[PDB]
Amino acid sequence: PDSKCLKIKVKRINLKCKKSSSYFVPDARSRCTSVRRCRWAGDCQSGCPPH
Amino acid sequence: IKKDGCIWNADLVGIELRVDDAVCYSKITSVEAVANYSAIPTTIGGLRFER
Ligand SMILES: *[C@@H]1O[C@H](CO)[C@@H](O)[C@H](O)[C@H]1NC(C)=O
């Protein structure tokens, strides 16, 4: 004779946007080091990288 | 002015010869040869460049 129902409840209708992509951008700093050496051989004849 | 550290592209010294002479002339200009060569006291514009 009868059956149950299905209720739909709506509370808020806000203006949002989609999600094209998702990522994380961290904070970075400046860190560096060097070393002072001498030629003393044929490894530093003219330049550091040959080609 | 030895090699292994000094860099030159091309056409910095000329060669001339008539009969087994092979005389070489100079093409290098000194520092006081280009235009807009200022000195220690400089007042170009509103800035007064001192030392
Ligand atoms: C010297 O300076 C003037 C004015 O700034 C400029 O017009 C001229 O091209 C400069 N000379 C050179 C060789 O750059």
Spatial distance between the Cα atoms of B49 and B35, rounded to a whole number of angstroms: 18
Residues of A with CB under 8 A from a CB of B: 45-46
Return the sign of the alpha-carbon dihedral for residues B26, B28, B29, B34: positive
Q: Which of B45, B2, B30 is nearest to A46 (CA)?
A: B2
Q: How does DSSP assign B1-44, residue by residue?
A: --SSS----S--B--B-SSS--B--B----GGGSSS---SSB--
What is the stated resolution of the deposited model, in angstroms? 5.2
Q: Whose CA is nearest to atom 5 of ligand 1?
A: B36
Residue type, A16: K
DSSP state of A24: -
Q: Counting atoms of ligand 1 from 1, which one is nearest the CA of B36?
A: 1
What method did the depositors use to determine the structure?
A: cryo-EM
Q: Tokens at residue A18, please? A: 């989609």
B44 lines ligand 1 (CB under 6 A): no
Give yes or no for a contact between B16 and B24, defined as CB atoms under 8 angstroms apart: yes
Give yes or no for a contact between B46 and B35, defined as CB atoms under 8 angstroms apart: no
